[PDB]
Amino acid sequence: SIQFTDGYEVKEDIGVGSYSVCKRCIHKATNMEFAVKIIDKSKRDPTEEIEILLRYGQHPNIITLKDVYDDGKYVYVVMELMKGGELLDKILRQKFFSEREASAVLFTITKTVEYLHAQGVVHRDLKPSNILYVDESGNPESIRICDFGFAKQLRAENGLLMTPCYTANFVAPEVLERQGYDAACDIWSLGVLLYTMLTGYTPFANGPDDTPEEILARIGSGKFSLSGGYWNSVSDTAKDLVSKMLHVDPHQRLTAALVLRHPWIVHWDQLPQYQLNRQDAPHLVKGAMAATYSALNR
Ligand SMILES: */C(=C(\C#N)n1cncn1)c1ccc2[nH]nc(-c3cc(OC)c(OC)c(OC)c3)c2c1
Numbered sequence: 112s113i114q115f116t117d118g119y120e121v122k123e124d125i126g127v128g129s130y131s132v133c134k135r136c137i138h139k140a141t142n143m144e145f146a147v148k149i150i151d152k153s154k155r156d157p158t159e160e161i162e163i164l165l166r167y168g169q170h171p172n173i174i175t176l177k178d179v180y181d182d183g184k185y186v187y188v189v190m191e192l193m194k195g196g197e198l199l200d201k202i203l204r205q206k207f208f209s210e211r212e213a214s215a216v217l218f219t220i221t222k223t224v225e226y227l228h229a230q231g232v233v234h235r236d237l238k239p240s241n242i243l244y245v246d247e248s249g250n251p252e253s254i255r256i257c258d259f260g261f262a263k264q265l266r267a268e269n270g271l272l273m274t275p276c277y278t279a280n281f282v283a284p285e286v287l288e289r290q291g292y293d294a295a296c297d298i299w300s301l302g303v304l305l306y307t308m309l310t311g312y313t314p315f316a317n318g319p320d321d322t323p324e325e326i327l328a329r330i331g332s333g334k335f336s337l338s339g340g341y342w343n344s345v346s347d348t349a350k351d352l353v354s355k356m357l358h359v360d361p362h363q364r365l366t367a368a369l370v371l372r373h374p375w376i377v378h379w380d381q382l383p384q385y386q387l388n389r390q391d392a393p394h395l396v397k398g399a400m401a402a403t404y405s406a407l408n409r
């Protein structure tokens with residue numbers, strides 16, 4: 112009945128689109144700010160994404176869905192609007208940011224992911240530009256995972272919503288092994304975020320110009336520096352977690368659960384409180400992230 116435009120008016124683009132765009136919008140009733148993701152139904156189906164937001168959006172650190180419309184051609188998904196900026200971007204421009212801090216941020220984010228995996232949900236696009244602060248309080252509880260345009264809910268061949276705990280229905284093997292790939296891959300994305308967090312540079316790209324072939328090469332051989340330069344003042348326990356989060360074999364790689372049982376997370380009070388020495392080139396790290404994931408998606 113009621114139309115999207117009826118109750119909202121569009122504004123600037125807030126970026127990051129695929130078969131879809133995100134624009135700022137004002138609820139022309141209450142004058143509050145929100146985001147809206149406008150998807151092309153002829154280019155992708157948003158159903159699996161919208162449900163995830165409906166069932167799971169309640170999580171404090173999952174972006175909150177406010178509304179949704181369908182004019183038969185596009186789907187409009189009105190969500191929370193982030194005002195604190197992209198989380199990594201803000202973290203890298205803090206000269207006074209220590210390991211105790213990094214462990215809290217990661218705690219909050221892995222806790223969100225672990226839950227999602229317990230409900231048979233995998234993200235599959237956990238790059239940094241999808242994690243944001245909702246406000247400028249700089250508090251972990253203001254962190255938000257914000258897209259889901261690639262997440263998948265585990266389903267039996269029978270069409271049944273499955274959780275990794277209940278197996279008594281039939282799910283195809285290749286779908287299961289893959290649900291273990293996509294979960295491991297999420298953890299690897301977090302490990303990349305952690306790496307960049309501690310040192311101010313990413314593990315497999317120096318900047319946006321790196322060739323897709325050398326980036327992929329670095330990834331395929333695993334092997335990423337964990338000592339010297341900006342790793343000097345970084346504790347051993349942190350380096351241990353990083354190696355196990357970026358472990359080149361998805362199988363030996365840590366689970367969301369196990370990450371959260373790691374001493375770097377549990378005994379966070381042990382962690383050094385002095386500022387981290389890091390490269391300070393946030394725009395370069397931005398380029399390098401996009402180069403890394405591009406080389407992953409093409
Ligand atoms: C657009 C989606 C998509 N696709 N998205 C989420 N994360 C990255 N891309 C989108 C959907 C809902 C949103 N709520 N707030 C924002 C938002 C994102 C960004 O990052 C570019 C901002 O700039 C830092 C921002 O500030 C206005 C809001 C958002 C994006």
Ligand code: NA
Pocket residue numbers: 168169170171172173174175
């Ligand atoms: Na939420």
